[PDB]
Nucleic acid binder design. Structure first.
Length: 159
DNA sequence: AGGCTGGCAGCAGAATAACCGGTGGCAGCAGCTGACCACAACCGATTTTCTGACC
């Protein structure tokens, strides 16, 4: 399925393009490396043709999962453990999982707790990073005008 | 049978990542003052010494 011209989503680097299929030699054999161009830090990631699904290279989302993550973002549930260390560990695990609904849960919990209390600079950086990957994912998914993706993010945050 | 004497050898030293609770400090400020300048006047003799009339 991975041809030149896609827009695939890495686990926690964001949505990236493809431009070539490298046949770079490993053990005297030409494993089909595919290249990536993710623009948050202009790093190029090259992965083997079959271990991408093992490491979690996930395709773009363009169906009722958009409504699913919208109702996840506008869900009434907000619960965290008592200690900030375990709460941060659980949110970091859900962030590193690389799932859109889980990242939506992370940003709704962090945005609710920041508009209620205001926690910390480290979780502020975490919320900025997770909001960046969610906004970039949906803006390259629906092709829906990035930063007007931020306006529709404001709409679903207002709920 | 070892020992304690002898050089011999080797070495130290000097000179040239967050939460929660609590508690005391602290600064800012209306709000009693309360002692204090502080002008500002007002009198209390005081002494001089004319001023005014007295016979």
């Amino acid at each position: 399925i991975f041809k030149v011209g896609d827009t695939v989503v890495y686990p926690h680097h964001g949505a990236a393009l493809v431009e070539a299929i490298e046949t770079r030699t490993i053990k005297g054999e030409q494993k089909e490396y595919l290249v990536l161009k993710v623009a948050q830090g202009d790093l190029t990631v090259r992965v083997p043709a079959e271990n991408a699904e093992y490491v979690g290279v996930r395709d773009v989302v363009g169906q009722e999962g958009l409504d699913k993550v919208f109702q996840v973002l506008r869900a009434p549930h907000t619960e965290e453990p008592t200690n900030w260390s375990r709460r941060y560990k659980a949110n970091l695990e859900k962030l590193a999982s690389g799932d859109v609904n889980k990242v939506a849960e992370v940003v709704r919990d962090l945005w609710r707790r920041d508009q209620e209390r205001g926690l910390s600079a480290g979780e502020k950086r975490m919320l900025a990073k997770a909001r960046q990957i969610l906004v970039g994912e949906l803006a390259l998914a629906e092709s829906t005008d990035d930063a007007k993706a931020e306006t529709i993010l404001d709409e679903v945050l207002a709920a």
